[PDB]
Structure formats: structure tokens, C-alpha cells
Design brief:
Five copies of one chain form a homopentamer.
Chain A (H helix, E strand, L loop, with lengths): L1 H11 L14 E16 L4 E13 L15 E5 L8 E3 L7 E2 L4 E5 L3 E4 L2 E7 L11 E9 L7 E4 L16 E15 L2 E16 L2
Parallel strand pairs in A: 1-10
Antiparallel strand pairs in A: 1-2, 2-7, 2-8, 3-6, 4-9, 5-8, 6-7, 9-12, 11-12
The structure holds ligand H92 (5 copies), 2-acetamido-2-deoxy-beta-D-glucopyranose (NAG) (2 copies) and oxalate ion.
Protein name (chain B): Soluble acetylcholine receptor
Keywords (chain B): Calcium, Metal-binding, Receptor, Signal
Organism (chain B): Aplysia californica (California sea hare)
């Protein structure tokens, strides 16, 4: 309708696109995971496949509007191609991430943005011992590929992974799943990089 | 020809694209399934592969026209890129959906749209006992990913899935299948979300009953 | 060369694209198949894989020209993305069709268009018995996905599938292969739909 | 830098794109193969997988220039999307060809173009006997899909396939590899079609 | 924000895009590898699968700017499609390379560009004997596909591959990993081509 069409036009067609965060105007991205299934374990390559969805949240000044000038609209759905999105990357993936959900985000009038992509990820993980009582632990770090802590900081609202949608007839049951902010120093690069460490302990269901 | 070119120019070139539904102007989408084949079952990963086509139907005021002004055209075929389509998503898929049919919809002069994508889906299903007489039951929810019940509502014209085109020499025979509207509350989000729940009961092709 | 550049400019840049057939201006598409190979049979999923090319031919008034006004040019090759092409679809496929030839068509001065895509198709077929003398029969319907018989009719020039290019060292030999126009109704839709039914009888090579 | 930006602007941004060859102005494409590996043999489906690169060469008047008018530039690299390229197709492929090299060509001042795509190809081949001393022979034709011999002719500079880059630890050794022009008639079509027939004899190492 | 939007507009919207290096304006690209995992070995096809990231660095005058004129910005992140990038190719790949990281580079005020793509590569490698204590050695050359040594030269900062992110529970342990500039003369082409040779010696853990 007319009001939403005006708002989208005023936000996206007038200005050039947001060029991303800088040292003077840094950005904090909130991350959270909802784990749906450990689909597959490969003991001959030490790869494990997860299905999850990842809640991403950030805020920009350039996406603010006054609701009363646009028919009391407080939020709207928009294609993720119309906006900047953070370059969050699994640091130990072995295949390109597969997208399982529409590339659509929600923008709120205060400038906040929320994007919740469902994904299937293959990553490095040794499953030896998964058929035992103690189970096995594996971890994967999620963070910006190209932005140091001076441009992108991360945090979580909770260190507990949401397990309320976990597939009840999975081959594997979860013993614990946590999501924790940490600071990393890489050999390539003298600046600190932030990531959220997803740590999942699991075993064969029996 | 001339009259259709004129109609498509007037609908798509003059105005900006429809920005999707809102709370003030919500939308109801009708869904229905025609199940063609259960292609395979993976008992080591609890994945099942379905081939089906999915009838989607909705109505917009912005796609209305008077047929008298356009050579009595009452409908037309158009690329699904030319129009908004609902973001209907399987909630327990394990692979991206594969598209098996041309991305083309039919628009009618009252503003109603019909779009019938044929798809192959891998989703989460435990096939233990599929080789029994009783068979196994599995389910997958289809609904909007991003829109709550305040912007998108769903319904079916019937709760009976169409099985009249099911592949007769499939490895799996279908005993029954239903498609039912339901309301969901996810822990991420306070608003109700609407889905259609596809339930399929099946077993390895034998037989008895 | 100057004449062809003029012709293509006059046909494609002076007008909007052809919007496809209608009830008032319907179209007949001629189909024929040339079967190259039955590559693979999967008896665990009842899928079979063919390689073939599919001659498509139709005629539009909007693609006519006088050869004497364009240096006696009687036909030309053009990208299939520059023209409308029919949405011919296999009705029992189990995977997206794979394209094995360049997406180029030939337009003739009478307005006729010929497009001959080579394809690999996986489709529903029970191969049980293929290792016997009687072999096995399988079938797949090809037709428009969205256009009824009132907008697109189909026909064939012959009911015999061309086997003159069939791979002589294939695992499978062809006993017969036919292509036949059919009409039927679907529950979705009030009008009849036209298809061409590809019926192939084959057995393991002896 | 400035002289190359001028030359490219003058060749591509002025005139419309080359519309391909015609009966009045036909084109000869030179083909040659460099075989890197026979990677895979599937005896259950009679498919074989090659990795190779394929030298394609042709010449157009609309790509000519005088070096002296452009800072002594005698050739340049450009995206293969910026130009027309020939629709050379394997006639017995069973999968889409996989592209293993960047889509960049080299244009020279006489109007000649050279494009050398690296490719992995699955094609129809019965490998029964590959484990013997005699080995097995397999063949695949490369030619235009849509142009007859009246618009596109083919040739080779040599009948021998270049084997100097063949992988020394491949499962298969090459006994011979030739590339030969031939004329073909298909039942679809009354005109002759030209192809280069790649014939490779090989056995297990 | 305002200053970065001005700078990007001034670098990418004012001028035509860089047309790549020439003989009069050659370019040197620095390469370095960080090996993360030997994921897979296929002893029936002699293919091996590596996961790594590859640091690429080069420098262009046309990407230079004065920080004082742009709010003291010394560098910025930009999409790799907005800039020219070198066509670095693995010369013995058997499949298209898979991209595992965002296609974003960092440009610095002196005109230097750094791009560090994460990749998965299948390449030709005989793994027979990987289950022994001696292990096996494999090599793959990385260089420009279309530019000779007269337009693109390569170098490394160090001969030693970075193994500090190597997956500790990999099926395979690394015995050595080096990256070495070499000069190649191919039978197709009479000019020298530069590559960096990645040599990895490994065995089952
Ligand atoms: N300040 C700079 O000039 C700069 C900063 C960062 C990079 C950069 C770093 C990286 C690495 C940091 C972490 C660890 C591996 C990968 N992600 C990737 N891509 C990049 F472009 C390049 C140049
Ligand atoms: N009111 C808001 O600001 C809002 C509303 C909806 C979302 C949103 C929700 C979702 C979730 C709802 C259901 C359950 C999981 C996924 N599908 C996905 N993507 C989204 F953008 C984000 C923000
Ligand atoms: N008259 C209309 O409003 C109309 C007509 C046709 C369609 C339509 C039909 C179909 C079905 C007909 C055949 C059988 C399955 C699929 N192909 C697919 N896609 C479509 F858009 C939709 C609406
Ligand atoms: N003269 C014409 O009107 C004409 C000429 C050629 C074609 C054509 C031929 C072909 C076949 C010839 C060879 C054998 C299989 C495939 N390549 C493919 N695609 C085409 F468009 C169509 C129409
Ligand atoms: N000067 C020229 O006319 C020229 C120069 C280079 C090429 C060229 C070379 C190559 C080869 C060099 C290395 C060895 C195999 C492949 N990569 C690939 N693609 C190309 F376009 C073509 C023409
Ligand atoms: C928006 O809010 C105002 C203030 O409460 C109200 O009067 C008005 O009816 C609302 N709706 C529109 C469409 O303006
Ligand atoms: C081109 O080559 C000539 C002859 O060697 C040389 O004298 C001249 O300086 C060159 N011109 C340019 C513009 O580089
Ligand atoms: O004539 C036709 O082609 C028709 O009516 O479909």
C-alpha cells in the first residue's frame, strides 16, 4: 500500500547504500542460534552437518523514520538485497553454507534490523565416541571475515542455544549447546576479531 | 499481442511493485498439495524426499483491470519475477528446495493470482517401520518465514491431499495424506504464525493393508 | 556484418517483448525427440536418466521480415534469451533438467523459430525386468506447464523417436521409442492440456 | 592505464556487438586440445571424465586496430562476456561441462582472438578392457551446435593432442591421442556440420 | 557514513574500471596460504580435497587517496565485484573451486588491496602410501591463467605455509608445507608464466 511504498522509496532510492561499519561508527551485531537437527556425521572425513537458524540483529541511524509521517508503520519486511547485512562466517566450514529460508529481513522504525537465515552447515568435527554414553563435543566459531573488533563487535542475549525446535527423532540427542562471545588473534592480522563460539555436546540417541 | 502488451505495460511499468502485505492490508493465501512421488528415504539420516506440486492462490486490488479496456482479456500468464509471491517455506527442510517447473503464474482480472510450483523437498522424517504393514507417518509444516498471522493467514480448500496423480510404480505407496491449517507459537517471536501441516502416511510397496 | 545488425536491431529494439500466446492469438509448437543414451537406471529409487535433444518449432508474425531489405538474409542465429520460448516441461521429472547445449535458436524470415536443446532428465520409471528379453517400458509426458490447449497446441512430424544418434555401446538397447500427442484434464484447471508422451521400451544390451 | 581504456572503449562501446558469422562472412575456428587427466571411469554407466584445456582461435575485422594509435599496444586481455565466442559443444556429453579456468580471452591487433577454457567433461565411453595391455579407445566430437559448415568451419594446427601436461600419476596412461577435422550429416538437418574428433586410446597404469 | 560514501563514489563512479595490468604497467601479486584441513582423499581417482585461505595482495595507483581529504580514513572494506582482482588459478584442479568466505576485500590509502578468499579445492594427487609413516607428497601450482610474467609477477613473504589454524583432529597430519615462486614455460605459449607452488607432505594421523 501507498504509505509503505513511500517509506521504502524514501529510505532506499534517495541515499546511496550504507557502506558498512567504520572505526568512527562501529556496529554491534547480536547473534543467537536455534538448533534444529544434527543431520549427518561422517567418520571418514570428520565432517558434521547442522541445520539451524541464526538470529542476527543490528541498528543503523540511516534506517530510522517517524511512524506518524508514514501512516503509523512501525516495521516492514524487505529483501535482504535492498540493505547491508553483516558478513558472518563459520570459521571451520568445509562446504558453502546452504540457504534454507527466504532472504528477507525486518526493519523497525528505531533503525533496528533483524535477519534470521535458516542454514545447513558442514564443518570440521571428529565424531569418534558419539556412540558412547559420554558423547562427543564439537565447536564452530561464527564471526565477521573481514571486519576486526574495531568495526564489528558481537554479543549474545543468552549463552544457551535454543533447543525448543530440536527434531525429536534425530539420530543424535543434545547433552549441551552453548553460544559464547570470545576474542581471537590470528597470525595473519594484528587486530582482535570477535566471534561467537557454538559448542555442542551430543551422542547417538539411546 | 497488442492488447496484452498494453495491459502488462499498464500494470507493471506505471507503478512501483507491491511491497507485500501489512497489518492494515493483510492477505490470505490458499495452499493445496498434489503429491507425485516419495522418491527415496534415508534411514541413516532420517531424511525423506518428496516430489509434489503446490497450488498457491491470493488476491490483490493492485492487479485488477476492466477487461473491456483491454480487448476482453480476462487473464494472462506472466513470469513470477514480474510480481510479488508469498515466501512459503518448509519448516523442517534439510536441503534447498529444487524447482521442477517454470516460474510462471496466471493473473485474473479480479486481481487473483494462481502459482503452482512443482518441487522436490528433502525434510526430516524417521522412516523406521516403513517396511511394515502399518507403515510410518511423517509431517512437514509449510508457512511464511517472515510474516506473522497479522500479515499472512493461510487456508486450504480441502484437508484431503490430491493423490490421484501419485506415481503407481513408486517404491512407496501412500495410505493417506492430509493438509491442515494450524497456529504456531515459536520461542523467538511473540506473534502467532500460521502454517499448513502436510501429514503423509506411507509404506514400502508390497500386499495386504 | 551490417545487414544482420540492422535486422536484429529492427526486430528486437523497436518493440516490447512478445508476451506469449493468448486465446485470440494461439500457437502450435512442433516437438520431436532424438534419443542419445539411457545413461543410468536406479532400481532403489525407480529413477531413470535419459540424454536427448528436443527439436522445438513455432511461428510468430512479429519475427517476419523481407529478405531483400536485409541483403538476402533468410535466417539468423540468436540467443534464446532475446526471444520468447515455450515452457515445455517434463511432467514426471525428479530433478531439475540439465542443459547440455548452448541456448541459441534459429529464426527464419517467415517468422518460424527452431530451438533444439540437448538435455539430461531424471524421471520416474521402474526398471525391474530390464535384464530380461522382454525388457521394460517407461513413459514421460512433455507439455506446457501453464498454457492450456486454447493457447498452446502441440504436434509431432512423426510418431517415431529418432534413434540414428543412439550410443552404440550404451548399457541399454532400445526395442521401441515413440512420441504421441495426448489431451487430458487436470483437477486444478477447467481447460484441456496438450502433451507429447515419450514412450521408450528398452533392455540390457545382449 | 589510459591507452588500453581508449582502445577498449573504441572497440566495444561504439558499435553494436558482433552478431556472429553468416553465409556471406563465414568464420574458421582453430581448435586444439591439451589433455591433463583421465580422472574417472564409470563401468556401470559407460561415462568417462576428462580434464583438458581447449585452445580456440578465430579472426574478425571488427577487432583490428593500429598499435601506433594506441601506445604500441599489440594485444590485450578482456572478459569473454565482452565479446562473441564460438558455441563449441561436445556431441556426446552426459553432464554440463565444468569450467575450471577464468573466462578471459586475448585479442591481438590483427583482429585474432584466442580463448583457452579449462574444462571437465563427462562423455559416453565404454571402458571394458581398460585393464588390459591393448586398452580401450574412446571418441568425442567437438563442433558448433547451431552453425553449419556454411557459417563455421573448423581446423586444427596439428592432428596430435598435446600430452606434455598429462598427469604423471594418473590411474590411466595414454597410448595415443589425436584431433581430426571431419564432416558430418545429421538426420535433423540437410547441411554439413564440421567437428573435431578427439580420439584417445588409454589403459590402466 | 558521509566520508566513506564520498571516497567510494570518487574511486568507483568517477573513473572507468581498471582494465588490468599491461607490459608498460605490470603488477606484482603477493600470495600466501593458510592450510586449515586436508578433508578428503580419493585413492580410486587420485583427487585430494584441501580447505585453506589464500592471502592475495597487490597495489594500484588508481586506488590511492589522501586520508586528510576524507576524514582520516586509512582503509575500507568493499565488495570484490567493485574492483579488479587477479585471475589466480590452480593448474591441476579437477573441480571448480568452492568459495567459503564473503567476497569482500580491504583497500588501503596507498592503493594497496588485500583479498583473502577461503576455498575448497579438489586437485590431482596420488594418495597411495598415506597410511605409512613416510606419508605422501603432493603439489599444486597457483598462478594467472591468461597473464604472462610480463604483466603479472608473483611472490611470497615466506616459504613456509601457515599451519597455525590447521585442524588438530584432521584425519591427516602435516609433515611439511611450503609455498615457492617458480617460473613455467608451457608448450602452448613462448613467454614465461609465474606460479606459486604449494607443496604439502602428509600422512594419516
Ligand atoms: N587492515 C588491513 O589492511 C586488512 C584487514 C583485514 C583483512 C582481512 C582479514 C581476513 C582474516 C581475518 C580473520 C582471520 C582470517 C580472515 N578472517 C580476511 N579478509 C580480509 F580482507 C585484510 C586487510
Ligand atoms: N517484529 C519484528 O521486529 C520481527 C518479526 C519477525 C521476524 C522474523 C521471524 C522469523 C521467525 C518466525 C518463524 C519461526 C522462526 C522464523 N520463522 C524469521 N525471520 C524474521 F525476520 C523478525 C523481526
Ligand atoms: N485459469 C486460471 O486461472 C489458471 C490456469 C492455469 C493455471 C496453472 C496450471 C498449472 C497446471 C496445469 C498442468 C497440470 C499441473 C500444472 N500443469 C500450472 N500452473 C498454472 F499457473 C493457473 C490458473
Ligand atoms: N536452417 C535452419 O532453419 C536451422 C538450422 C539449424 C538449426 C539447429 C540445428 C541443431 C542440430 C544440428 C547439429 C546436430 C544436432 C544439433 N547440432 C541445433 N540447434 C539448431 F538451432 C535449426 C534451424
Ligand atoms: N599473446 C597471445 O596471443 C596470447 C597469450 C596468452 C593466451 C592464453 C594462455 C593461456 C595458457 C597459459 C597457461 C598455460 C595454459 C594456459 N594457462 C590461457 N589463456 C590464454 F588466453 C592466449 C594468447
Ligand atoms: C495513525 O495514528 C493517529 C494518531 O493516533 C490516528 O489518529 C490515525 O487514525 C492513525 N492511522 C492513520 C492511517 O493515520
Ligand atoms: C611506440 O614505438 C615507437 C618505436 O619503437 C617508439 O619510438 C614510441 O615512443 C612508442 N610510442 C608510444 C606512444 O609509446
Ligand atoms: O490453432 C491453435 O494453435 C490453437 O487453437 O491452439
Amino acid at each position: 500500500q501507498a504509505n509503505l511504498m513511500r517509506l521504502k522509496s524514501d529510505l532506499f532510492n534517495r541515499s546511496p547504500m550504507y557502506p558498512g561499519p567504520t572505526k568512527d561508527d562501529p556496529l554491534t551485531v547480536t547473534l543467537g542460534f536455534t538448533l534444529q537437527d544434527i543431520v549427518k556425521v561422517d567418520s571418514s572425513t570428520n565432517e558434521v552437518d547442522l541445520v539451524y537458524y541464526e538470529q542476527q540483529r543490528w541498528k543503523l541511524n540511516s534506517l530510522m523514520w517517524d511512524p506518524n509521517e508514514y501512516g503509523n508503520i512501525t516495521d516492514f519486511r524487505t529483501s535482504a538485497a535492498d540493505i547491508w547485512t553483516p558478513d558472518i562466517t563459520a570459521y571451520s566450514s568445509t562446504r558453502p553454507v546452504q540457504v534454507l529460508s527466504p532472504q528477507i529481513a525486518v526493519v523497525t522504525h528505531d533503525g533496528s534490523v533483524m535477519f534470521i537465515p535458516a542454514q545447513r552447515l558442514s564443518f570440521m568435527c571428529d565424531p569418534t565416541g558419539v556412540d558412547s554414553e559420554e558423547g562427543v563435543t564439537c565447536a564452530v566459531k561464527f564471526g565477521s571475515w573481514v571486519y576486526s573488533g574495531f568495526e564489528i563487535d558481537l554479543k549474545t542475549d543468552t549463552d544457551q542455544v535454543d533447543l525448543s525446535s530440536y527434531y525429536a527423532s534425530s539420530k543424535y540427542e543434545i547433552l549441551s549447546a552453548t553460544q559464547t562471545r570470545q576474542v581471537q588473534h590470528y597470525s595473519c592480522c594484528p587486530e582482535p576479531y570477535i566471534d561467537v563460539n557454538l559448542v555442542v555436546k551430543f551422542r547417538e540417541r539411546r
